[PDB]
């Protein structure tokens, strides 16, 4: 299973962000608002979660052979991931998620504060003009082989377009001592 593909718990669905390693042990990053739901996932057991304030969570794979260090492009191909980086305003980026597949756009702001109402407030989010829909959360924000973020939320949809916010992946990797595969 690669970045952008579906991960579920009971009737809930989110997307995998990036497969990573913690001291050689295969894990998967996704959104914290997703991991808050349950400890039991289709791919394994949750070992960390942080939402709101932040929006990241980590799951240890039941099957280490499934930790595919790529992003699925929804056209039968995958993008290889090799490093993690920080986004910059104007960067050309792509997002992969299980509801809308692959979409592209550019980073329009950094360190955005996002008020999700009853769900709470998140800080330090990457802002883009890429659309997303429910189910896309946790999926991959990347530029070529560089991982940048995890889909958190936004406004609009993929028909009318919208604004989306992402948790910077570097903060999630350092929270857990992980490295992208």
């Amino acid at each position: 299973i690669a970045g952008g593909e579906a991960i579920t718990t009971g009737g809930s669905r989110c997307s995998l962000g990036f497969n990573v390693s913690v001291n050689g042990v295969a894990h998967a990053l996704t959104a914290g608002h997703c991991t808050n739901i349950s400890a039991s996932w289709s791919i394994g057991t949750r070992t960390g979660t942080s939402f709101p304030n932040n929006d990241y969570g980590i799951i240890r794979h039941s099957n280490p052979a499934a930790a595919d260090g790529r992003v699925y492009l929804y056209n039968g191909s995958y993008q290889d991931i090799t490093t993690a980086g920080n986004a910059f305003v104007g960067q050309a980026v792509q997002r992969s998620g299980s509801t809308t597949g692959l979409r592209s756009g550019s980073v329009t702001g950094l360190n955005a504060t996002v008020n999700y109402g009853s769900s709470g407030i998140v800080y330090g989010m990457i802002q883009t003009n890429v659309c997303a829909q429910p189910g896309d959360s946790g999926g991959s924000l990347f530029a070529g082989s560089t991982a940048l973020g995890l889909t958190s939320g936004g406004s609009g949809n993929c028909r009318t377009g919208g604004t989306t916010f992402y948790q910077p992946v570097t903060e999630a990797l350092s929270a857990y001592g992980a490295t992208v595969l």
């Binding site: 959104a31 608002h33 929006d55 998620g97 509801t99 996002v114 008020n115 999700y116 109402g117 769900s119 997303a132 829909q133 429910p134 189910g135 896309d136 959360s137 889909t151 958190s152 939320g153 936004g154 406004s155 604004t163 989306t164 916010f165």
Partner: peptide
């Protein structure tokens, strides 16, 4: 905005 809302969480997806």
């Amino acid at each position: 905005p809302a969480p997806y």
